[PDB]
Amino acid sequence: HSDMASKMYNTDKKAFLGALKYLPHAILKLLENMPHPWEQAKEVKVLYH
Amino acid sequence: SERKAINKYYPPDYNPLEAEKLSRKMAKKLKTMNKSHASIRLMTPFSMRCLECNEYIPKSRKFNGKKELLKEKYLDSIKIYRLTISCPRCANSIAF
Amino acid sequence: LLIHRKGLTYLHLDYNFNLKPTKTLTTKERKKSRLGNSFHLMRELLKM
Amino acid sequence: DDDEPPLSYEQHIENIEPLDPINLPLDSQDDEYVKDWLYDSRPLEEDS
Amino acid sequence: SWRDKSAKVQVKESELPSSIPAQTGLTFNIWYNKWSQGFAGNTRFVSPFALQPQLHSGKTRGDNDGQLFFCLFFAKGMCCLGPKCEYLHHIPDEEDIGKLALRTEVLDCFGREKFADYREDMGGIGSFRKKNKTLYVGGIDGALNSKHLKPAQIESRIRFVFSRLGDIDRIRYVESKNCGFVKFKYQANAEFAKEAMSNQTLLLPSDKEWDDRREGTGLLVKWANEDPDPAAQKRLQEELKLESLNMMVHLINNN
Amino acid sequence: VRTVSIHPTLDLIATAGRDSVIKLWDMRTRIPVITLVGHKGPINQVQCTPVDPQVVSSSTDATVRLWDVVAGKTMKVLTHHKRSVRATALHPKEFSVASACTDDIRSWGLAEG
Amino acid sequence: EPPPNICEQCLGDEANIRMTKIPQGSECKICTLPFTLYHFKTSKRSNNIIKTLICVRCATQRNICQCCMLDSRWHIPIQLRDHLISLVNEENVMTEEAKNDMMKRFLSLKNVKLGGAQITSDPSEADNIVDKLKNILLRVDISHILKKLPLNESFLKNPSTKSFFLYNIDASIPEWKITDTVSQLLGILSLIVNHKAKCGGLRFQSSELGERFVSKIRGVLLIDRFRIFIIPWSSGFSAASFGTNTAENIKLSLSLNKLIQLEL
Amino acid sequence: YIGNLITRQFEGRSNEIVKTTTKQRLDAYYDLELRNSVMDDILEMMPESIRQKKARTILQHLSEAWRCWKANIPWDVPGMPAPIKKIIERYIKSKAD
Amino acid sequence: HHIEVVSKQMDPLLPRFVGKKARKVVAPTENDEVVPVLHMDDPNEW
RNA sequence: GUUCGCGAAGUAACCCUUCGUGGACAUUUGGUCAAUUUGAAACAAUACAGAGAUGAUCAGCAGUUCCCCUGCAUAAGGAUGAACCGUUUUACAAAGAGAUUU
Ligand SMILES: [K+]
Ligand SMILES: [Mg+2]
Ligand SMILES: [Mg+2]
Ligand SMILES: [Zn+2]
Ligand SMILES: [Zn+2]
Ligand SMILES: [Zn+2]
Ligand SMILES: [Zn+2]
């Protein structure tokens, strides 16, 4: 989903715009799990569409 | 974007000097860059009467008019401009 | 995609989430492209 | 830069070994009860 | 027969054309897949691809899956999937018309849903009200790259290409209007042939123009309006009466 | 808005005005559950009633209307008044409504219209 | 909210059909207003998915199936139905369809049946119509091209000919019927017919096919008792044989007509 | 916020936005309701029930009475019916208060 | 025919009602029943 | 495939390896949707016109509408957002009086 020019991505484009209302939640969840200074690389469980 | 935006987007390859030089080459061929008059909004500076249809035009009426810089200059130094309106009833061109 | 669905391709979004016009805009373009606080709040949170 | 896309993680980042984090050097004797585990991501998460 | 062989791959996946259309504005709109900021230059272009029915037809997964609908891109001569295609890769025939005979009232032979009203352009899929079997063939000058050609010669070309694509009732060419009308036996063949011949050239390999065939605009194949010719109108009335009388038999025998 | 009437048994109110409709509101959720359409002019009075017809309304169109609120339909239209039916009242102890024009007060049995 | 109106021929013959309901999932093809979409498959492993294209109130207005728009009693299309009824009723009835979108929305909400629908929406009327239907069934360069056309010569055994000239073609005849009857005779073929000329030409693949064609009965060919006449055309033909314009074709047709009337 | 925006993008904007009575709209809505009140009273009391042109005439007399009140000019129209005169003066006094 | 009616779970990131739009409609005022109006029997003064 | 059981051959080994075979375990995805022109995004450009009240210029705030746009919006803005400027004949009678059909 880099360019999304083909007709196959119409439903995906609609899903993208509908995802926009849930971004601040995702931003909270990301920043909440931010690595602290003593850890190099934090593996995190994710949920994705 | 707002009226008072500070920045416009330039493409990453944009060189301003080459861009101006290219746009200068382009400007000699565009229609609206080479037409002989500039459209302006202006008030009628004095009361005047159309000669085609005898309509009185009062002072301070707003018009959409054409501005021409003339070749002649006052004492060869100061710019003179013709200001052209069109009569509101009969659409005939009035100039001063 | 929200910018482009609204037809505002004359606005460009940087990869650091600044929104800039690509050209000096007509008055009709300015009225048509007057995005609101929802978009801008979303954009600046993404920027942070 | 504003005009550079966000980096591909797998191409540019996944292969690089990370640098040392901020860890204070603990004493092998005088911190012995915490030295083995203080800096884990979830300390003692496997110690039943 | 097409049943004797597996379907040929018409175009490879790497050979398929780009999805971004030819530029007609200053900026590409990632939503609409079209150019914004100005609109200049024509959007029509000649198809790089053309169906070759005896060469390209063959069995696919659709024949094994019990599929009804034909492949849209097979008709366009640009199907990527070849024998792995879910859709049927052959010219429609009475067997498949019979299999389509329920869905045909509201669907295209390509399985596209029909509309109430035709487009003002008379292009597109067509109306579920009309059951039209006739194609208008325009843009013939562009389809020949503006080559001068005699009217009977043009008619012979149109006769050749459209007769590969189905059973035909009538072909007529009108010199004054410089347009052709092709009527099929079945609406499914009119549906198919429209998409098969849209944006194509009428040129030959034998022509002097063949090496620049891609430059102009191709054939403009649309649904035909009702024929204003009174002979055609009374013929239409006669076949309407015949269809009605044949239907009375079914209604009476069922009730 | 020209009038409000509180339903005697339901947690419901009726309201009407110059927009020529009666809107019934659930008190709690503040949703306009039902809009009653049929008056041809401003509504002057609304009366809520414990059984069908559960709303009675009077209008500048010179009608009194008796409503089935579940169907969204009139039970009866009363067309005996000449002018705007500006005033109305329920009788507290018998199943009847009075209504008035200029010079013309009338009383109606609500079980029948 | 009314139930879906789907015919048995859409639903098939399986004992059970799973159906998916989607409130306000689709916009009606007739009236453009939203409606509750139903969609189903005739069996679990059938690969085509059938959906309601029109809303229930448009369907009851027309007495048609929501999934195939054929009449929900007689299983025939609206145009043919209204035409059939208007042969039994002297005063014509037809389904008048809105063209403006606001009129499409307006028309769909009035609860009155349209065209032939009410005459088919109850059994008494529909049965009366079919009872009456049983009574119905109980009741200028011509002077040059005429030497290019083979009209001077005859249908013969000896000359090997791959191409033939067809005339006395009635305009009612489609091209496919001609090809089909030749296919029947040969037990299976490039055809040009110009209907404004009322004549045509037939070209075979190889000489043995033409010889087998001339082996079966100037000659004659039959299409529903239209007597197409046939002549061997040794000189090869093209579309130009019948005239370059419409007027030339019509003039040729009249010339061929008087030649036929002399031959008969 | 984003939900309402994207809802407008797909569903479109509601056809029936009811503007509320803010202080920019207060005087105009007062005028409309007062005008309707005067018209209801006069069309109810007139014996002949003739409406279409008579209404537009009567409310001009109302507006003239208001101008006279603000000017402190005595509003007196010769041949005005006494009851309609009383109705107009009644509504002018309420607006004045 | 016995029909099992289900309602499959919608993609929460797509619009919930695909056919839904803001569109205006003029409703027909059809009515079969005529309603009677039931009244009974110096212009310079007014 | 794993496993329980029973036959044939290894190994008179009844367990282990192989072959034949009975049973158990596991049971119907997905699509409202196909990949460029012909099932419908908008601005911009070009030419011409041009700014609500009226003598002139301008602040506005409304209303009606099967016009909506921007906006989180029941706020506000869009020229006071636009459209509004046109068209206009009968619920038609009474009294006379002069030409006239009958
Ligand atoms: K203003
Ligand atoms: Mg405003
Ligand atoms: Mg306004
Ligand atoms: Zn003048
Ligand atoms: Zn294919
Ligand atoms: Zn509908
Ligand atoms: Zn059906």
Curated annotation (Swiss-Prot), chain A:
Give the residues annotated as coiled coil: none
* Cellular compartments annotated: Nucleus
Task: Describe the task this protein carries out.
Answer: Functions as a scaffold that mediates the ordered assembly of spliceosomal proteins and snRNAs. Required for association of BRR2 with the spliceosomal U5 snRNP, and the subsequent assembly of the U4/U6-U5 tri-snRNP complex. Functions as a scaffold that positions spliceosomal U2, U5 and U6 snRNAs at splice sites on pre-mRNA substrates, so that splicing can occur. Interacts with both the 5' and the 3' splice site, as well as the branch region. Has a role in branch site-3' splice site selection. Associates with the branch site-3' splice 3'-exon region. Also has a role in cell cycle.
| Subunit architecture | Component of the U4/U6-U5 tri-snRNP complex composed of the U4, U6 and U5 snRNAs and at least PRP3, PRP4, PRP6, PRP8, PRP18, PRP31, PRP38, SNU13, SNU23, SNU66, SNU114, SPP381, SMB1, SMD1, SMD2, SMD3, SMX2, SMX3, LSM2, LSM3, LSM4, LSM5, LSM6, LSM7, LSM8, BRR2 and DIB1.
What else does UniProt say about it?
Answer: Present with 468 molecules/cell in log phase SD medium.
Free-text domain note: The MPN (JAB/Mov34) domain has structural similarity with deubiquitinating enzymes, but lacks the residues that would bind the catalytic metal ion.
Protein's name in the database? Pre-mRNA-splicing factor 8
The organism is Saccharomyces cerevisiae (strain ATCC 204508 / S288c) (Baker's yeast)
Organism phylogeny: Eukaryota, Fungi, Dikarya, Ascomycota, Saccharomycotina
Q: Which residues of the full-length protein are shown here?
A: 146 to 194 of 2413
